[PDB]
Symmetry: D5
Subunit: 156 residues, 10 copies
Amino acid sequence: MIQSQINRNIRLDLADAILLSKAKKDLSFAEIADGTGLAEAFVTAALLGQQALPADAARLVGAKLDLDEDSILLLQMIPLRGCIDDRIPTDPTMYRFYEMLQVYGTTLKALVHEKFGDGIISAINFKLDVKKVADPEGGERAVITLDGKYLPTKPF
Amino acid sequence: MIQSQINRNIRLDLADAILLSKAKKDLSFAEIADGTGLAEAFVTAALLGQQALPADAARLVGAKLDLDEDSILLLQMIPLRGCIDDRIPTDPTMYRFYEMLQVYGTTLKALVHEKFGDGIISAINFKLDVKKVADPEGGERAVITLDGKYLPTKPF
Amino acid sequence: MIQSQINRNIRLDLADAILLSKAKKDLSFAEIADGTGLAEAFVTAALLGQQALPADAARLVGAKLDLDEDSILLLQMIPLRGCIDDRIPTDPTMYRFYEMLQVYGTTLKALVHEKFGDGIISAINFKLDVKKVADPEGGERAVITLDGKYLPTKPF
Amino acid sequence: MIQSQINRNIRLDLADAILLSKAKKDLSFAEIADGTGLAEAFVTAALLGQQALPADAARLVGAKLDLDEDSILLLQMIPLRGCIDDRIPTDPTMYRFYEMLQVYGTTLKALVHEKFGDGIISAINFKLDVKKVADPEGGERAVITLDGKYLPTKPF
Amino acid sequence: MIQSQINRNIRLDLADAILLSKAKKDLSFAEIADGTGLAEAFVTAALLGQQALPADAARLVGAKLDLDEDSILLLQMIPLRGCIDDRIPTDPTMYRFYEMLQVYGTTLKALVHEKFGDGIISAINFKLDVKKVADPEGGERAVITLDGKYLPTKPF
Amino acid sequence: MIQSQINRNIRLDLADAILLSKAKKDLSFAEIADGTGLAEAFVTAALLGQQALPADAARLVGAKLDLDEDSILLLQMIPLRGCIDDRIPTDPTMYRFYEMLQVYGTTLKALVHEKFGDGIISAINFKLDVKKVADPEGGERAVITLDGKYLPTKPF
Amino acid sequence: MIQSQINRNIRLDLADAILLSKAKKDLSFAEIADGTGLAEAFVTAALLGQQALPADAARLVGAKLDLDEDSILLLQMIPLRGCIDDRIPTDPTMYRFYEMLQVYGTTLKALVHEKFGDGIISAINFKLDVKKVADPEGGERAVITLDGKYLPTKPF
Amino acid sequence: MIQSQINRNIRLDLADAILLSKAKKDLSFAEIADGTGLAEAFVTAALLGQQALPADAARLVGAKLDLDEDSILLLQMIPLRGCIDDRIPTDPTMYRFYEMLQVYGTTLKALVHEKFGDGIISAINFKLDVKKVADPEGGERAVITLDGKYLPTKPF
Amino acid sequence: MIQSQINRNIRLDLADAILLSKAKKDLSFAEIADGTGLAEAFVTAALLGQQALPADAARLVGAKLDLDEDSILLLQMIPLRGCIDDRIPTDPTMYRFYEMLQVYGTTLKALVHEKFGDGIISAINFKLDVKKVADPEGGERAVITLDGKYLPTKPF
Amino acid sequence: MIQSQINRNIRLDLADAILLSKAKKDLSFAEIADGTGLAEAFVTAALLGQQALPADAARLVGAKLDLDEDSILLLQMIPLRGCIDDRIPTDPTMYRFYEMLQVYGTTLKALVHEKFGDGIISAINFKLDVKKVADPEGGERAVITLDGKYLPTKPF
């Protein structure tokens, strides 16, 4: 796939139409991803304009959501990524993950360098998943797993 | 603890001093946290100005790092939290965690609302840990676990 | 329930239409919320794009305001919250509540840590109400009650 | 009093020194304000650079805290108000009160105009207090009362 | 009037239409405000989205400018105030009044506190008027009067 | 005077020292400007770093405040003007004058063009004064006069 | 002219339409301004939304460009000035004039105060022109002349 | 010269020192540059941190201003250029040159492309000068000449 | 070519249309640029709104992509350059080139001044090339060549 | 190396000290890096706070520059990277490399996705080289090579 986007608004406008059709059809993201062979977080991210779907998956989710052919094609383009409106989220749900960075950002840096060395944990060679577990004290918790490759920074 | 800070620079300046002592002594954060009864991410965050240590742990890390009494006292104060200089990290290691929000922030929202409902995953009733593992294709990966309680939003 | 929004413009445009219909019909927010079983601040926030109405409430307010069926569905979706255009309000009425934070924000932090300990007062597990009272010196006063759960930060 | 400040850093530096002395002495804000004739929120705000204390209270708290003569005079100066470092708080405890504005700011405007008319709720003719209560579901809640005069805007 | 706006663009779009009609009809703001019983600065501000006209005035200016009924109703709505596009004006004419704040802002604070005490000069209980006078050395000057109530900040 | 500044911090630091001296000596700005032949708003502005005092005035005020010779010379330098820390004031007293621009900025433009023509009201060929007057409904008001030359924009 | 604009987008949208028509007709700005009696920089700035054309000049360029009556009227309105999208230009050609400010801004201030005194060089009583000349080393140079009246700031 | 700076504060601190010494010695920029063979705008800019002086010029002006040897060396380093504190000047004198860009920036672009073609007017191969001329209507004008090489953008 | 744009949205909107047509016809940028005589980086940049195509090339690519005549003319127009939505890219692919500047920006400055002297490497007299090479360690690398003319800064 | 920094000011203050010593000793970056076995761009970036030197290289450059022991240790710490003062460079030399991103940023994205596919060119597994070459038309050019590993984005 060699086609790519440069203006996020195209795929984000499409995401809005996907969300409307999904709401009208009472569909979950789990059901939309079911049968693609792709993880729900990857498929969901594509619907929301942040990943590219392979052709087969694009056609399958397109049927489910009743998308036109131009829309099924856009879903296959490599996106201009960046889902936050203006750098810092205003939405509370979305903001808590930013706050995690404000509280633990330097600790994540410190422990990455301690355990791995100079370099980065990838956001590209990277997977994430969201799991609901019972809280032994009452209620529920989310266990969100960020799984990224370590890439070293080495002299040259 | 009822004492709290309002100017992050005080504890951030102490953090720099801690990092210098730690470097001169060839200590790791795991080493410093060993024996405190507390997780390495929590103790590390406290050293870096983002948590408060209980008195016993403050005295122990203070002995390990040869910190003076004002410093051992400062570590027990509730901090003015926020480790990022100016909202968006410039450091590549830190930035990748912000990039994961730019790529998956709306997906985390979507999947939280689907699995839990309206509300948030907490950044307060919250634990995180960093694990080094083998990458099955070669090299190493970080598995970073964000473990947060779900708090619902419901009508009143 | 499980459907959510990622572009606040959709629900904010709906808010503008609701406000137009509301004005043509000479309706108050108190009137619109009457019979929903929900507090006026909660129903008002939903109309203005910041909460989700349960289905029964959406139909009741929808009938009162003569909203079409797409609008009645939108009111039930979980919003992308954030009512301020660009971080700091320009409107004097809204600004005073921001200035309240500029004057007392560190005092709120200090007293919260003194009375409760390390942690937060929730904006999620949270109730708001606005009460008009006579001023014994002449005039009227607003008594605005912010009622939020304390969630502690504890070591792990 | 007719003397005022133009650089908030002077009074905020004094606040840092006050907090250190307060912590060394194991004092609460409630104790410091005791015998002052003034509400804890007002005295605390003055200590943190956001209000001016009368000479009598400045000397009383100054003695309690061991402040030099220049500091007790500073406490009586009219401040350059503004406690937030850079417009939006990073600290989670302070941030939650900002988030209340992001979620309810337009609701507060709408309900103020409905109950009072065109105008504002004052942040000057204004009192606030923080009370700790039981949470009938378990735990504790903060009831924060914002009590502000209504000033109307009327044609001229 | 209990109806209010939350999106300034609606009234600012109306303002644009008002300005076009006013130009096609060769009307001045003084002419439009004549007969309303209201000062030219107040009526002009309402046309430009920054005040609410009483019903009688709205119908009068609506007839003078040939406004439709939706517009006459909009002019009676309480606005979301804030006429500056992005905080600092680019327009030279508007910018000069911002520059006066950059040069004299702390002087105004200093002199207000000297003459009145701790508190504010109101922008709500407030009148302004623009008068053209001769410059004794040749040309013209504008004498702009800001007339605002003093509200004291008093301890509690 | 041909000497000028490029770093506002030097004169603003001097302002801080001036305000301390003035506080210890219990002086008013009216008192300090007395005997200079200059308006209190101009002398106050100079002390706060926003105007240059002629040598005779600099020596007069410098005597009253007990300033060293380096400071009396600094006050005669042409300043790098700009009294607001970061574009928008946080202080309530100075914020109200910014709010006047958010509400009436476009009205001031519109009326200036109507009365004078294309061009500006100067902030350079400019006087301002602050006058306290009784409010017939009770209390006090500030009448603040901005008096600026009209300079037209004319085709070339 | 007493009619003015408050939303720059109206005149900037007209500029876009003017530019398309101009390119279709293979016209230069020098040709469009020919016969108006006005300098090419003034007429060009008017077309681009930053000056008001006298009526006769508006009709002349309107004929050359095939503009409709509403557009010819718009060109005569006093504009809401400000041609830069967001404060700092991104376009290399316009950025160099900003860079000229970053490099020489304080030099221009220092030399203006040295040669003229305290005060400003006007941007209002102001002419500019662009001239192409030979570079003695080969190639071409632009000689851009900023011709502004000196307005002093003197005590009052 | 192969040495360069990366932190503008070093040379800007030197500039403040230079300006105090210059003020104590009652010197003009014209006098300081006299005998260097360099234009007053180039020498002034170097003193203010925006150019590098050759060795002989640095020794000359350093003698005139009684600079230490470290300071004379600093004047010869290639600077980290950028004289504006925070992107947009607050000083009225410098702001007017920014306003010329807000009003004429697109006109400068348009006329450069018309006269020269696609490309830029250099800010590097560039000369500027400030000349005082009498205004035939009374008073003084500044004629500021920006003289830059045209560099074309050509396809490759 | 003497015609130029001032609003980037016109050419960027055309870019979006070009990308959609390019995706529908399964074309690459190398293919589109084939037979124009122009480097793929230059032609691609023109399509994406950042260069002007000569007329012959504009008609060739216009045919390949089924562009209408307004669009083929627009491609020949000198653009208002600037492809980044809001100064800092959000897209990871684009961001890495920004991170290169955050890590090596001062090194590039230092080494340019060391090897060439005071002055700049041009972004105008400039060629850009992207080549894919095999990584001896496995995988592939991009070798991106920035070839700019050195322009000296010399005293005047 | 497991030790890392969180406050860039420490290493950037050291960079300033290094640059002073380097200028006093009339050293080039090429000579400082000679004998380290590391590329001049790597060693230079380390001196400027953006890379960590191995211990032997730290000692060798520390000897050349006469650095104290704490400085030789600091050069070995993993930095808090980010060399740009405030996101966008002000310095002309550094700004040109940002301008290349404003002009070619979307072209680099497009061509990377065309030649390699979805994913990124690394700034971490990355080397850069600056080469001076004669310009056949006269003068000099810089050939700057960015050599980064391709990391693909693939579904999971």
